[PDB]
Design a protein around this ligand. Structure first.
Ligand SMILES: [Ca+2]
Ligand SMILES: [Ca+2]
Ligand SMILES: [Ca+2]
Ligand SMILES: [Ca+2]
Ligand SMILES: [Ca+2]
Length: 275
């Protein structure tokens, strides 16, 4: 069944209200500090001397979907050109993440919507497709299987001396805590006055610069995984107009176009919040 623009905006609001594992107001203290003009993002000047996350209540990271998500963030080599080889325990981490997110109201809402729209006949089929499109390996650089949709969006990569991808707040917080991310500034702070919020950030990640990295702030991993999958499944390759807490938010997805899985199906090249 065709998924309409109106149907996308209804399910995106259902996903937003169902996100009970999101950070509560008291679980994160943000310090956005200096905002610069979009014309100054190539300056590479650190205008924020304090970390972006002044405090995060790390008990949030004991929630099973956060623990399973964080367990995946040490499985990759950010520099493209280095093939990825997952251990049996690392493939079990992918299954554990998918099993944990499927227990949430967020993923139950998305699967129910997609099943009603006749895109998937079963949860098993849907989980298998998600595992392929997100965790399947493809080649961005010098070696085979150095990248994936999940690595690009959630872990972040370095290609040709610049940061590429890197759109997740938990990954940002954990690297910043280790001194591996240095927050420089933002150009945009979304209309939400609660979590999830959106910030468009400039930052240095262990020697490489990210010019405009838009990220949800305070969302659970299942919220982000559901919305990015919704945009990719319903509108692959296009800008999908979501509605979140009554405010519009546009997301771009692109298919990977150098390889396929199964019967000519596409891996996710990227999913991101547009400027
Ligand atoms: Ca429909
Ligand atoms: Ca791991
Ligand atoms: Ca990699
Ligand atoms: Ca700084
Ligand atoms: Ca805001």
């Amino acid at each position: 069944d065709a998924i309409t623009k109106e149907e996308i905006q209804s399910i995106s609001e259902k996903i937003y209200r169902a996100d009970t594992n999101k950070a509560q107001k008291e679980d994160i203290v943000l310090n956005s500090q200096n905002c610069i003009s979009p014309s100054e993002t190539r300056n590479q000047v650190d205008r924020c001397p304090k970390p972006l996350f002044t405090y995060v209540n790390e008990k949030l990271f004991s929630k099973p979907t956060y623990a399973a998500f964080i367990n995946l963030l040490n499985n990759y080599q950010r520099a493209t050109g280095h093939g990825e080889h997952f251990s049996a325990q690392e493939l079990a981490e992918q299954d554990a993440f998918l099993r944990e997110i499927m227990k949430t109201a967020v993923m139950k809402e998305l699967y129910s919507f997609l099943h009603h729209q006749n895109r998937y006949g079963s949860e098993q089929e849907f989980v298998d497709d998600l595992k392929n499109m997100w965790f399947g390996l493809y080649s961005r650089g010098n070696e085979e299987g150095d990248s994936s949709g999940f690595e690009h969006v959630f872990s972040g990569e370095v290609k040709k001396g610049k940061v590429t991808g890197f759109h997740n707040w938990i990954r940002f917080y954990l690297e910043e805590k280790e001194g591996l991310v240095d927050y420089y500034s933002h150009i945009y702070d979304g209309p939400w006055d609660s979590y999830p919020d959106v910030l468009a950030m400039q930052f240095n990640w262990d020697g490489y610069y990210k010019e405009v990295g838009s990220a949800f702030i305070g969302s659970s991993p299942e919220f982000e995984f559901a919305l990015y999958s919704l945009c990719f499944i319903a509108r692959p390759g296009k800008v999908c107009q979501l509605s979140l807490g009554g405010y519009p938010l546009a997301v771009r997805t692109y298919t990977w176009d150098k390889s396929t899985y199964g019967n000519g199906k596409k891996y996710i090249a990227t999913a991101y919040i547009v400027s």
